Specification:
Blueprint (H helix, E strand, L loop, with lengths): L13 H14 L18 H4 L6 H9 L6 H18 L5 H21 L1
PDB class: dna binding protein
Keywords: bromodomain, epigenetics, DNA binding protein
Assembly: monomeric
Length: 115
């Protein structure tokens, strides 16, 4: 509350460390469905169904231009990429499996870097 604060967690390396995580997600062999925005002209149903499209290149641009206020808003966009994937793709598909694999890979790196 006013003039009553928990001890200050060092957040000075968060930007660099989110960048490293994102680099590792970008270079994973199963990243290919997620590297670029879904083409809304060429994929029937995507525009109407997925209210907030997100992909790795859009996260990279937001990160590089100071559009993440803190590490949690960064995690929320990464998770959105996988939530969107699950909304649109069957579990038993190459893309559906890719999204599950990448979500796992992310959540471990997130826990190990920050928890």
């Amino acid at each position: 509350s006013m003039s009553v604060k928990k001890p200050k967690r060092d957040d000075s390396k968060d930007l660099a460390l989110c960048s490293m995580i994102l680099t590792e997600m970008e270079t994973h062999e199963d990243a290919w469905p997620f590297l670029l925005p879904v083409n809304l002209k060429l994929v029937p149903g995507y525009k109407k169904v997925i209210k907030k499209p997100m992909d790795f290149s859009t996260i990279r641009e937001k990160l590089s231009s100071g559009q993440y206020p803190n590490l949690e808003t960064f995690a929320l966009d990464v998770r959105l990429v996988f939530d969107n994937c699950e909304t649109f793709n069957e579990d038993d598909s190459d893309i559906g499996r890719a999204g599950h694999n990448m979500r796992k890979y992310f959540e471990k790196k997130w826990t190990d870097t920050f928890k």
